[PDB]
Amino acid sequence: GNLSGKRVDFSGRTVISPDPNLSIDEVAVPDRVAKVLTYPEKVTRYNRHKLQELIVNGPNVHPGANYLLKRNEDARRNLRYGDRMKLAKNLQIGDVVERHLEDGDVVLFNRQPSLHRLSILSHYAKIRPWRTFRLNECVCTPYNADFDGDEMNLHVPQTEEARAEAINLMGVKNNLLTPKSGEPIIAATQDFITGSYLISHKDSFYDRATLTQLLSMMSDGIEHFDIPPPAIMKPYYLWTGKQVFSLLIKPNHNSPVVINLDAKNKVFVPPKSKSLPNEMSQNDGFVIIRGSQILSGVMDKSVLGDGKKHSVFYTILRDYGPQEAANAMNRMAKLCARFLGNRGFSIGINDVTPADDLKQKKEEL
Amino acid sequence: MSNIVGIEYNRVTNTTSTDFPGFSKDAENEWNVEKFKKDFEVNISSLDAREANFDLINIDTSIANAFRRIMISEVPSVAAEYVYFFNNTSVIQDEVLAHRIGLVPLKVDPDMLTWVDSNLPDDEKFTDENTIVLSLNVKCTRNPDAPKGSTDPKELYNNAHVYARDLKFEPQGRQSTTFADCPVVPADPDILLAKLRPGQEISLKAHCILGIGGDHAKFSPVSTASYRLLPQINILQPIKGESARRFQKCFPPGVIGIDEGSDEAYVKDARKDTVSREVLRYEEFADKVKLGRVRNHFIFNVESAGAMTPEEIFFKSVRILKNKAEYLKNCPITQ
Amino acid sequence: MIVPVRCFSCGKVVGDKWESYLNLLQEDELDEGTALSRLGLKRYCCRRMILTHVDLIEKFLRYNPLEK
Amino acid sequence: EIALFKYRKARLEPGTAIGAIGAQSIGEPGTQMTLKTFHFAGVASMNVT
Amino acid sequence: DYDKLPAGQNATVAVMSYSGYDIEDALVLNKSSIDRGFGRCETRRKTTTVLKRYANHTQDIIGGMRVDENGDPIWQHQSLGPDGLGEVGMKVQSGQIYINKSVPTNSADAPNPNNVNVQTQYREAPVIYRGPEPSHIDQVMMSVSDNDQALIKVLLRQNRRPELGDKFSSRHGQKGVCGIIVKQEDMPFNDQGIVPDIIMNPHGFPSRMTVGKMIELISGKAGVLNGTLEYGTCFGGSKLEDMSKILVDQGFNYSGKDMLYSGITGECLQAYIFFGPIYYQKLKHMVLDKMHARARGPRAVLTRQPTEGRSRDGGLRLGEMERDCVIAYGASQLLLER
Amino acid sequence: PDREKIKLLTQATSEDGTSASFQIVEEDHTLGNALRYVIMKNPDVEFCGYSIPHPSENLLNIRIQTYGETTAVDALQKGLKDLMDLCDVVESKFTEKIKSM
Amino acid sequence: VKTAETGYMSRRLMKSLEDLSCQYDNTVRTSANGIVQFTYGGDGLDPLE
Amino acid sequence: TLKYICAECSSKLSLSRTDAVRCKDCGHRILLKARTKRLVQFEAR
Ligand SMILES: [Mg+2]
Ligand SMILES: [Zn+2]
Ligand SMILES: [Zn+2]
């Protein structure tokens, strides 16, 4: 008899959709539910210029408002039945309007089987087309999202003090670790791993007809990059694939990001059992990063994304704050989604058939 | 970088065109309009009324993909837009039946129409040089001279199957003499839109405007606009015999040739190859064949919907891709 | 219900090739592959429109709400 | 400097709700128990919970 | 006889990673393919009223046709005929009335019948259509049911197209929501010119081990060519050996891997991509009847369609499992606010 | 004269020419790739790249970054006049082959 | 059957481990100031940091 | 106004208020309404 109980105003429940073109601290809200979920704003010296136009635009145009509350409490004046743009002209300094949900508003976001404290995070809003609560996929792992038509809940705080607590000690950028073990739980995911193994594979050598496009796809145009001198020269000017992840950690001299970790990845081969460096392996294996420069190893699940204490974004988080780790996660999440669609990756029936020798060893053994 | 490309049994390399000044130390291959005028040329395989096949050599994948991309959307065409219904008492719903009138192709020049301004009221957007009006009016009637047995709905029913030929164009407004030389008909009149029974009737009127293929699929002037790179089979270690005849039976029959009363095999008419790399899994033919395709050659193939000739669509696409380049250089850059 | 006017993928008009297909099935007896090959369609797309299609409007018009 | 900075920030901050955190850190791995019968014995000598 | 009444669509599928809106259990869709009739559906709902004969020899009559200053009729009445019922063919948007019902206001209790004039009082109480998108009136039917009592059944149909939020199955349990409707000038085009209809993420196969779906394309793509619908029956069907023989002498790959020329850049794709047709099917559970929101007060403003059926998944509530999550944050001023 | 067709973003361009960025409304991958190829054939340009930031809009952000003594507002004009010259070369060769056959 | 017991153990464990917080003297106590542990974990270190 | 249609014989009939709702030709107890004679607008997209 310890069931759900309470009924809370100003909430919605809608299905979820994929979107890695969105930042990790943002959930895109459609304009059909960001028209009835209002936010009460008191008018002051610093919002009189905006709230007049906001009242004039009305309840049907999206940058608008639905209700109005007078200072001496006349009534709760709705902006639908009469009382046109002259009502925005008086606007006494204690009036409370109920504006629409706009871009940048703090909103908390939930999934109904709440297991632990990473099931209720808090995001920024963004007003979009078609009617679904789409979100990024680096942030869907703490919600345990496996999308397939699942629904999620959305609540807006209605005061100035609870809105400050959702974004400071409850927001996404301040909760990059699970408290169960200290490991990062909210990091890179499925298609962001195989899009990183194919760039940082050793058989990848790029060119300025490709490398420039690779740097432009990860920062949607506007970012100043310093192109390093190439790893291959005078026969063919060729840039390796490990100089792309070396560049998205630290684009230019203006970013202070210096990363100096080294740890082994997933499935690993001992080099010769005599070579004292751990990175002389038969495969790529052991990863060296010295001064935001990858010297060896691929970017798989262990090094890049969810897992142990030796991640890259964990190092950016401990050394250079949460905002830079969020920027690097956004940059790789909108690099991989553009690259892997234009490289090509498929499975088929050809990659599962035994080639008539396993059919001999299976009959033998 | 390392020309005509390699087809491998598990991958394909040499994808990027990379002919820019900065691939190597020597600044090779600048823009040089007089060099591109010398290198580029066009062959033509065939020209039909609704099908065109032609070839472009020495040209990038980028600005030849651009032509393929804006053959579909940016070249405008006309289609049925607004359908007004009277007494639709058939079995097909009036959203389904209106969706099928939009998808029939119309045979008229889209240069005789002007774009609709979407800021005017509903009684002022549609004028004489803007709208093509069609009318369907079919009532089904039982045939009194019925045969000896009930066999098919074609017999014993007057006009139970409507067709695209029953969309009659109406001379609208004032300019009824401009379309008197070429009245608009559907491109193929045998389109089964509905089936009727006696007692049923369809009476409607359709307004047809101009649109691009990026807004909706029905305005796309071309059915299939695509290309293919020219394949190539470099056969070294020229060995002959029974294995050369097994080499023939893999491929399509008219793409390599055994010499009749003479020496070993060769390659004739490599244009007809659909590359399936079926000779790269044998272990008999390992260092004796080399599949590939030349990156600079393109075989443009266009089959239009029926509105216009397919040799006009390519010229209009080159004109459209030119006109959006000079429109951008004559605009001021606002900070 | 009825054959679609255009094919879904590329957009070739295949709505005019259903009555001719039924005429080639019953008289001039051929298998569906060759009779669908000497009719137009070359790719396996736009061939799927005529091959895998059920004709429900002939079964719907037996329940006419008119006179009968 | 790096060692003292990483040790000084590592202390438990006052006002933390660490009793509520320790209750969710145990019950949340509890909700993914598949069967997996093990044994503190040899060849299936005991069945332990 | 499932082949006489099928429920689904034969799509064409490029199994590849594309555009990034397909990460887990998410399909991307083609614009200019759903514009040509892929996945269109319609929803038909019944609204029934009964006209009760009360105890003191009176009825509840239907009526209407009221006008006001050249409005013929008013905005709330322009879906009704002279009888008072919705006519066939019109559309019904929000609060416009489609059945105008009026009940007597004095015949609630039983004033045992006198011959005094009291029957000239009618309190109207019609039914009012409400919803996000408008509908259409296709049938309205009068009935005279068992105890001589008038019955009105009206049907409302609504045309729907596939959008972001609508889920699709794959006849193997590969269900997934729609991610994005992509343009037709995208979606790599396999030089003959077959643009894919639905692109599927190739990561759903190792964690789920549905390799029989991989046999659906090979026995499907080689089934379209020589005009024979194939058999995929259990413990038999079409053998994989002689279906790749039909596919290899038509000019295709034996394993279904075609080489795609990319759509946004025009160059080739560095891996061969498994292409072919899959029988897809559109389910229930669309987004248009699941978007539910609430501002303040009862009778929430964004109300979904009332078809739950033993599926009460909480709703717009804040349970004790969610109360325990914000204690771990330590936010004390959000507890009082929520 | 339209002033909303092409812009120049504020907190992305460096001083005195070099390393500039532009924003074009109502544009898809077509002229983006066609303009990325022509500017890359300029020996005074390092970094020319386009991107569509979000697919449900009509925006294209292009970035042009040069070596020296060539402003990126001038390498955009030089890389756009040459596309007109390419379109003049293409349609003149295609017309005479339809004509002469 | 796991959905019926999706939160039964973590909610019952939440009953006692709820009103425990670290005070400003680095001691974790209950709500009635009854002290339960003099320093958290024996050393007072935040397991998140 | 042409308000009724039988569901068996499909006979166009129209009776006024409270006039024993049935068919005068066969006797069928349910009656359908005809499609209206006004103009309805649709969009071919
Ligand atoms: Mg799920
Ligand atoms: Zn097709
Ligand atoms: Zn009757």
From Swiss-Prot, chain C:
One MF annotation (Gene Ontology) recorded for this entry: DNA-directed RNA polymerase activity
Swiss-Prot/TrEMBL keywords: DNA-directed RNA polymerase, Isopeptide bond, Metal-binding, Nucleus, Ribosome biogenesis, Transcription, Ubl conjugation, Zinc
Location, primary (coarse class): nucleus
Cellular compartment(s): Nucleus, Nucleolus
Binding of Zn(2+), residues: C7, C10, C45, C46
A Pfam entry, by short name: RNA_pol_N
Cross-link (Glycyl lysine isopeptide (Lys-Gly) (interchain with G-Cter in ubiquitin)): K59
Transmembrane domains' residue ranges: none
Record GO biological process: nucleolar large rRNA transcription by RNA polymerase I; ribosome biogenesis; RNA-templated transcription; termination of RNA polymerase I transcription; termination of RNA polymerase III transcription; transcription by RNA polymerase I; transcription by RNA polymerase II; transcription by RNA polymerase III
A GO cellular component annotation in the UniProt record: RNA polymerase I complex
UniProt similarity note: Belongs to the archaeal Rpo10/eukaryotic RPB10 RNA polymerase subunit family.
UniProt miscellaneous comment: Present with 5300 molecules/cell in log phase SD medium.
Subunit structure: Component of the RNA polymerase I (Pol I), RNA polymerase II (Pol II) and RNA polymerase III (Pol III) complexes. Component of the RNA polymerase I (Pol I) complex consisting of 14 subunits: RPA135, RPA190, RPC40, RPA14, RPB5, RPO26, RPA43, RPB8, RPA12, RPB10, RPC19, RPC10, RPA49 and RPA34. The complex is composed of a horseshoe-shaped core containing ten subunits (RPA135, RPA190, RPB5, RPO26, RPB8, RPB10, RPC10, RPA12, RPC19 and RPC40) where RPA135 and RPA190 form the DNA-binding cleft.
Protein's recorded name: DNA-directed RNA polymerases I, II, and III subunit RPABC5
Recorded name of the encoding gene: RPB10
Swiss-Prot record, chain F:
GO CC terms of this entry: nucleoplasm; nucleus; RNA polymerase I complex; RNA polymerase III complex
Compartments it resides in: Nucleus, Nucleolus
Keyword terms, alphabetized: DNA-directed RNA polymerase, Isopeptide bond, Nucleus, Phosphoprotein, Ribosome biogenesis, Transcription, Ubl conjugation
Intrachain S-S bonds: none
GO molecular function, one term: protein dimerization activity
Record has Nucleus as a keyword: yes
Residues in cross-link Glycyl lysine isopeptide (Lys-Gly) (interchain with G-Cter in ubiquitin): K93
GO BP term (any one): transcription elongation by RNA polymerase I
Primary location recorded for the protein, binned into one broad class: nucleus
Top-level lineage group: Eukaryota
Further comment: Present with 8680 molecules/cell in log phase SD medium.
Family: Belongs to the archaeal Rpo11/eukaryotic RPB11/RPC19 RNA polymerase subunit family.
Role noted for this protein: DNA-dependent RNA polymerases catalyze the transcription of DNA into RNA using the four ribonucleoside triphosphates as substrates. Common core component of RNA polymerases I and III which synthesize ribosomal RNA precursors and small RNAs, such as 5S rRNA and tRNAs, respectively.
Subunit structure: Component of the RNA polymerase I (Pol I) and RNA polymerase III (Pol III) complexes. Component of the RNA polymerase I (Pol I) complex consisting of 14 subunits: RPA135, RPA190, RPC40, RPA14, RPB5, RPO26, RPA43, RPB8, RPA12, RPB10, RPC19, RPC10, RPA49 and RPA34. The complex is composed of a horseshoe-shaped core containing ten subunits (RPA135, RPA190, RPB5, RPO26, RPB8, RPB10, RPC10, RPA12, RPC19 and RPC40) where RPA135 and RPA190 form the DNA-binding cleft.
Name of this chain's protein: DNA-directed RNA polymerases I and III subunit RPAC2
Curated annotation (Swiss-Prot), chain G:
Membrane-traversing stretches: none
Gene name as annotated: RPO31
Function field: DNA-dependent RNA polymerase catalyzes the transcription of DNA into RNA using the four ribonucleoside triphosphates as substrates. Largest and catalytic core component of RNA polymerase III which synthesizes small RNAs, such as 5S rRNA and tRNAs. Forms the polymerase active center together with the second largest subunit. A single-stranded DNA template strand of the promoter is positioned within the central active site cleft of Pol III.
Note: Present with 6020 molecules/cell in log phase SD medium.
Intracellular or extracellular location(s): Nucleus
Quaternary structure and partners: Component of the RNA polymerase III (Pol III) complex consisting of 17 subunits.
Domain of life, per lineage: Eukaryota
Protein known as: DNA-directed RNA polymerase III subunit RPC1
The family this protein is said to belong to: Belongs to the RNA polymerase beta' chain family.
From Swiss-Prot, chain H:
Chain sites annotated for binding Zn(2+): C6, C9, C23, C26
Residues annotated as transmembrane: none
Function as written in the Swiss-Prot or TrEMBL entry: DNA-dependent RNA polymerases catalyze the transcription of DNA into RNA using the four ribonucleoside triphosphates as substrates. Common component of RNA polymerases I, II and III which synthesize ribosomal RNA precursors, mRNA precursors and many functional non-coding RNAs, and a small RNAs, such as 5S rRNA and tRNAs, respectively. RNA polymerases are composed of mobile elements that move relative to each other. In Pol II, the core element with the central large cleft comprises RPB3, RBP10, RPB11, RPB12 and regions of RPB1 and RPB2 forming the active center.
Gene Ontology CC terms, in alphabetical order: cytoplasm; nucleolus; nucleoplasm; nucleus; peroxisome; RNA polymerase I complex; RNA polymerase II, core complex; RNA polymerase III complex
The entry's keywords: DNA-directed RNA polymerase, Metal-binding, Nucleus, Peroxisome, Ribosome biogenesis, Transcription, Zinc, Zinc-finger
ZnF endpoints (C4-type): 6-26
Protein's UniProt name: DNA-directed RNA polymerases I, II, and III subunit RPABC4
Compartments in which it is found: Nucleus, Nucleolus; Peroxisome
A GO molecular function held by the record: zinc ion binding
Entry superkingdom: Eukaryota
Residues of the full protein shown: 26 to 70 of 70
Description of post-translational modifications: The N-terminus is blocked.
Other comments on record: Present with 907 molecules/cell in log phase SD medium.
Family: Belongs to the archaeal Rpo12/eukaryotic RPC10 RNA polymerase subunit family.
